[PDB]
Amino acid sequence: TYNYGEALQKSIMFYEFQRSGDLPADKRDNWRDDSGMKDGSDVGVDLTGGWYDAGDHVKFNLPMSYTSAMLAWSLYEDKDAYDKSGQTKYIMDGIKWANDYFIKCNPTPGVYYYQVGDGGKDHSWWGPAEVMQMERPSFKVDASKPGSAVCASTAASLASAAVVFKSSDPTYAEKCISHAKNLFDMADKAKSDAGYTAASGYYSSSSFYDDLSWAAVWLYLATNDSTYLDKAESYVPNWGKEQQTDIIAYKWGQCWDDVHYGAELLLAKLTNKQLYKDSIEMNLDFWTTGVNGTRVSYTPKGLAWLFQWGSLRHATTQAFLAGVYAEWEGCTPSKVSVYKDFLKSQIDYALGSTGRSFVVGYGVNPPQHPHHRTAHGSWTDQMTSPTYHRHTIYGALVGGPDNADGYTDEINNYVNNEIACDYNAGFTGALAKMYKHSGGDPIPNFKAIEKITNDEVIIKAGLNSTGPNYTEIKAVVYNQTGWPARVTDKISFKYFMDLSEIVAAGIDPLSLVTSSNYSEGKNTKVSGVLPWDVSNNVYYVNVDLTGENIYPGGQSACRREVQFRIAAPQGTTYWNPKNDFSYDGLPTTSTVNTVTNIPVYDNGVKVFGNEP
Amino acid sequence: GTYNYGEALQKSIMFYEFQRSGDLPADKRDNWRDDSGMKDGSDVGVDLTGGWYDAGDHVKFNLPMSYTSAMLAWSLYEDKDAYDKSGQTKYIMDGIKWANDYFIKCNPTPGVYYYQVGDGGKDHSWWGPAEVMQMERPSFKVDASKPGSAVCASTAASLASAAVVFKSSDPTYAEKCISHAKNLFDMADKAKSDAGYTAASGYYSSSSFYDDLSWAAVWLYLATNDSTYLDKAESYVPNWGKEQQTDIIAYKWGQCWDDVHYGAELLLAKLTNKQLYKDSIEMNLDFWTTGVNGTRVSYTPKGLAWLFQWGSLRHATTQAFLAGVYAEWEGCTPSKVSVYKDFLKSQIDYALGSTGRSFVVGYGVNPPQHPHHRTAHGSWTDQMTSPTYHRHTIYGALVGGPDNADGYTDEINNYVNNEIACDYNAGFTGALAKMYKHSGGDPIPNFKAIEKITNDEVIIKAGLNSTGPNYTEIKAVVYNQTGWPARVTDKISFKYFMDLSEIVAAGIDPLSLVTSSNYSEGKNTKVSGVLPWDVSNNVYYVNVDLTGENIYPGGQSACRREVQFRIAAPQGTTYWNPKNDFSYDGLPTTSTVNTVTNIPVYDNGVKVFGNEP
Ligand SMILES: OC[C@H]1O[C@@H](O[C@H]2[C@H](O)[C@@H](O)[C@@H](O)O[C@@H]2CO)[C@H](O)[C@@H](O)[C@@H]1O
Ligand SMILES: OC[C@H]1O[C@H](O)[C@H](O)[C@@H](O)[C@@H]1O
Ligand SMILES: [Ca+2]
Ligand SMILES: [Ca+2]
Ligand SMILES: [Ca+2]
Ligand SMILES: [Ca+2]
Ligand SMILES: [Mg+2]
Ligand SMILES: [Mg+2]
Ligand SMILES: [Mg+2]
Ligand SMILES: [Mg+2]
């Protein structure tokens, strides 16, 4: 027995944590903030927004548009489930988030930016989205350098968004259609992926006629112009055949690189032509009862297993298509129960039928180490530290087990433990169907405002050098921010002393010499002695780090060391560090430890430690 | 700072030798502990002598006692190289054998197990050394009708772990240990109840037995290589305590006498490599170090991982041991190895001296001087306040420890922070063995605890009680202040010397003078007539014999005997002269007795205090 409503709620929420750009004031978390704010600056176009692809920060438009098209398809099929669960606003905000970005990516007729970020450079750094420091180049396709698959996948997303938004926001629906029409025209004129090269190694395209059909079907549903339905059907002979036959491929499943499964399902419902009915049932039969002596492999515990990478992604996506098709009056009657049983068995495997959940922050023993940079929240550019994720990325469906149900919840296992937009796409639609059928209430007013689990900015210190007339401190400030991760360019700290002995010597405490033999950072400034509470002879040295680009993204990047000394005159012996507030407990060597008596300030406001 | 881990290890093992009850070996390396609890088990007609006293008291509580020896054996099983290198292997094996020989005695027939000797109330109502305890020490047992699963299983774990470490050098003993371990484990397993475990209520109540069952089963598997036991160990896991609002195995406490699931799951991870156990032990170790999912054990400002008010050092050093063992296993998450090893060192260093003082008795800088311990203190008057210092150094004892703000006071009745106990040193010993392996520190060669005797053991105080023209009457009080070892002194006598030249000169027989006693405290006190000492020089004496008197260092009245005696010249005469009498010189003239050195005291005829003419 599983709570499908809560699963649906979290699956939709997952996308909110993948958001790039200027985040809404109404966001329900305290650990994601503005990021990729300069996206498109290299080309002079505002390309901010959209979703980060997986556990990384590249914006790959092919799987991104596949995702939003699939979410819109679910809303088109099961609006009643979203309304009943109270999740309609959230899934529509997600669909609009992706589509607003695709619109920005088509700034002028005939031009389409299909990517922001370099796979290699982006993947070479392990840290939060908010503090990325590397270049994020924009890439585009046009008539001279075509991208049929990505243009058509984007048109499908835009057109499907138009279908589900038309009732409540007819103007946005028209806006989506205008851009879908342009991108489809680009894809249809070109019939080539030759200029779609920036995603090589990550989302290279192996087919585009499937995307042309899928986009044409959605443009037909969005505009009711039969010109599109005729085009949709015209590409069918060009879809890849099953190896060793002259039959439309049926041994794989709906995914970001192959959408002919969804296109044929939709063409079956729209035309009732036997060709489409036979094709989709051949695929669904292969995945369930088996067909013509062949069948997708099943793990011992009941998972329809298609491939090593994202096994759950494949199974839950096929579950969604099986659910949609089983509801159609044209489905072979005897297969309705078979397909519906399949939808339930596969979704249940993801939610907990093996004894544990494969959905982050949901169910029994959910994964705790998904391969995801921002949810982990390292501040040292290390997958290994901290040894636990600082944030809970609710709703994320992990890759999944191997062919024998084997699974290792480790952060470095990106084959079976990464999470991604496309992984949750079909999954979300299958969950909506299970919810409408078996229920399970979503958590009321669900938010992801987390407790701060570690001091965000800390200071470590130790006695570096000492003498009869001086004290020399080694201090290191650390940015361990996570709610949200952020640059701390206004940090300072204060070192307090009791100078009663200086006053007793007839010496002005303000005349003591302060100095610094070493400091990381160009802006580090150590002040002279300043009064704090002279009635109790308390003075201090202010160490200002304002201007320093301290950020949680590397061992050096997150810290600033400062060695400073305060000294009475040469030959004197009255200097007494033992009555100094900041000296108490201070480590006796240059081995530094966290101290609570050399307070840290952020723009003058105390955030760590204590004052006298 | 740098700490000598080998010396710490050698002393921590030695601590248990000072906790020994029973017929002590002739090989003992101290001069202040001796035979005690020699009638243990007499109330039931079973030899239950031996084993270790629990803490600063003399009750034998088998649950923490067996937890202790099981933990020592675990350390020897994990780090035999450390014991061999430090030359401590023999000493730790003798300790493990001491406990286990007693547990064997406690399982005299299959199906019966004596789990305690001593009544908490009777034992704690007297403050004195083990050797002279006078109270009844009842024995308590569990059986099928009145079960004790936790104590039977903890004892089985001890016996099975002993077998594992003794198999190579003494297979016959290992075989005997296994036989008893199997019976105690079977009793525990079949009963699954602590209903009959009642005599330790308030001291060592059991809050769980499924943990003990897995712990015992794991050790029986290691001792026998019979997978039947591994299957059993794993079967109790679903019944182990869980974290409050989850279905996750408990992880917010630590390994201790009442909860051994931490040690059991750590060993199960190493023996099976199952993710469940790895996850479980790492959640516990993470809670104790870096924290896990917004939760971490409290830490004092000076670095001590602080779990609870009682035995804060006990808990921290035990977790240090587990961290050290786990960190060395190939299965440990690579990125946590250094965190765990750092923790092992930081906690042990806190115990040894990182705050500026040591929390280990007789070790390092400014060690505790007043641990809550009857025998080490050595009162001879049933007073926690007297003497005002400890007469003995109980080397190696780890005190309870500071509060959560590093506060600590070294006082005898700071029974919380200054308590010392078997379980407090168990995990600690294992952690020290790991640190010695990692960083060395040379133990003291052939270290012994032969103490200098710091107070005269049997003394006499005297004063003038009455005087007249023909007599001297003395008030004398003999005191047993024995401590090396505390002991009954039933053969004490003393001699009062006089010069009777004036009696002889007056023409009176000196051997005819009337001697008498107007008051004697004991029924066996005998005052002789005048006897010759050196007749040539007119020196004579009176012998006062206290032989038969059960004088012992365990109370104000118990440790002393007052005797008043008088020697008289003939009635009406005035030539008696006490001023030329050796024993009269400097004698307190009032009656308020003061220690004197001219009325020599003898023990079985041998002078032990004072001087002869
Ligand atoms: O492309 C596969 C996954 O790579 C992940 O980044 C790796 C990178 O590929 C390695 O070469 C190396 O740099 O370590 C990185 C971190 O594991 C990337 O984070 C995933 O999103 C990719 O799917
Ligand atoms: O911690 C393991 C590794 O994780 C990521 O790949 C980081 O980019 C790399 O710097 C680190 O060494
Ligand atoms: Ca394609
Ligand atoms: Ca000062
Ligand atoms: Ca227990
Ligand atoms: Ca005389
Ligand atoms: Mg804003
Ligand atoms: Mg990838
Ligand atoms: Mg002051
Ligand atoms: Mg003997």
Report whether B368 contacts B455 (CB < 8 A): no
Nominal resolution (angstroms): 1.8
Residue from A414, A415, A416 to probe ligand 1 pocket by mutation (most atoms less than 8 Å from CB):
A414
Let me know: does A12 contact A428? Beta carbons within 8 Å.
yes
How far is residue A477's CA from residue A457's CA, in Å, rounded to a whole number?
7
How many alpha carbons fall within 13 Å on the CB side of residue A473? 32
B366: left (phi over 0), alpha (psi -120 to 50) or beta: left
Q: How many Cα atoms within 13 Å fall on the side-chain side of residue A294?
A: 12
Which residues on chain B are in Cβ contact (under 8 Å) with A596? 301
CA atoms within 13 A on the CB side of A172: 18
Q: Residue whose CA is closest, atom 7 of ligand 1?
A: A123
Report residues near ion ligand 4: CB below 5 Å. A 498, 576, 579-580
Inter-chain CB proximity B301 and A386 less than 8 Å: no
Residues B304, B351: contact at Cβ < 8 Å? no
Tell me which residue in A364, A387, A454 faces B335 most closely, judged by beta carbons.
Answer: A387
**Ligand 1 in reach of A591 Cβ (< 6 A):** no
CA distances from B108 to A430, B36, B179 (A): 67, 21, 12
Locate B375 and state its tokens.
């025998």
Say yes or no: B109 contacts chain A, CB-CB below 8 A: no
Query: How much distance in Å is there from the Cα of B99 to the middle of ligand 8?
Result: 60
Instruction: Give the gyration radius of chain A's Cα atoms.
Output: 30
Residues forming a β-bridge with A515:
A565
Contacts of A608 (CB under 8 A, 6+ apart): A455, A456, A457, A458, A459, A596, A599, A600
Report, in angstroms and rounded to the nearest whole number, the Rg of chain B calculated over CA atoms: 30
Pick from B383, B546, B378, B548: nearest CA to B478: B546
Q: How far is CA A279 from CA A268, A274, A389, in A?
A: 9, 8, 44
- Closest to A239 (Cα-Cα) out of A323, A149, A313: A149
B438 noted as active-site residue: no
Q: Which residues contact B182 (CB under 8 A, 6 or more apart)?
A: B156, B220
Burial group, residue B369, by CB count within 10 angstroms (0-12, 13-18, 19+): middle
**Backbone angle region of B254, left / alpha / beta, with phi > 0 → left and psi within -120 to 50 → alpha:** beta
Residues of A in contact with B302 (CB under 8 A): 585
Whose tokens are 């990021």? That residue is A35
Q: Do B286 and A453 touch (CB under 8 A)?
A: no
Spell out the domains of chain B, with CATH numbers in brackets: 1-449 (1.50.10.10), 453-612 (2.60.40.710)
CB–CB of B528/B498 below 8 Å?
Answer: no
- Residue A335 Cα distances to A201, A329, A431, A499, angstroms: 39, 12, 20, 88
Distance CA B429, CA A62 (A): 62
A12 phi, psi to nearest 5 deg: -70, -45
- The rounded Å distance from CA A383 to ligand 2 centre is 5
Cis upstream peptide for A107 (omega within 30°): no
CA separation for the pair A448, A521 (Å, rounded): 36
Rounded to whole angstroms, the Cα distance separating B268 from B276 reads 9
CB-nearest to A387 from B247, B290, B294 is B290
Give A 546-585 residues with CB within 8 A of chain B.
Answer: 585
Write the DSSP assignment of B547-564 as a string of letters: TT--B-SSSTTTTEEEEE
What's the rounded Cα separation, in Å, for the pair A144 and A137?
19
Distance, in Å, from the CA atom of A3 to the CA atom of A79, rounded to the nearest integer, reads 19
Nearest alpha carbon to residue A62 among A74, A76, A50: A50
Which sign, positive or negative, has the C-alpha torsion A22, A27, A33, A35? Answer: negative
Relative to the CA of A420, which ligand 1 atom is closest?
21
Task: Establish whether the linkage from the previous residue to A484 is cis, with ω within 30° of 0.
Answer: yes
Chain A nearest CA to B344, separation (Å): 17
> Known catalytic residue: A371?
yes
Residues 6+ apart with CB under 8 A from A230: none
Give the bridge partners for A462, in sequence order.
A474
Contact A388 B334 (CB under 8 A): no
* Residue nearest (by alpha carbon) to ligand 1 atom 23: A414
Is residue A383 in contact with ligand 2, taking CB distance under 6 Å?
A: yes
Separation between Cα atoms, residue B437 and residue B30, nearest integer Å:
27
| Side chain identity at residue A353, one-letter code | S
Size of interface A-B (CB pairs under 8 A): 23
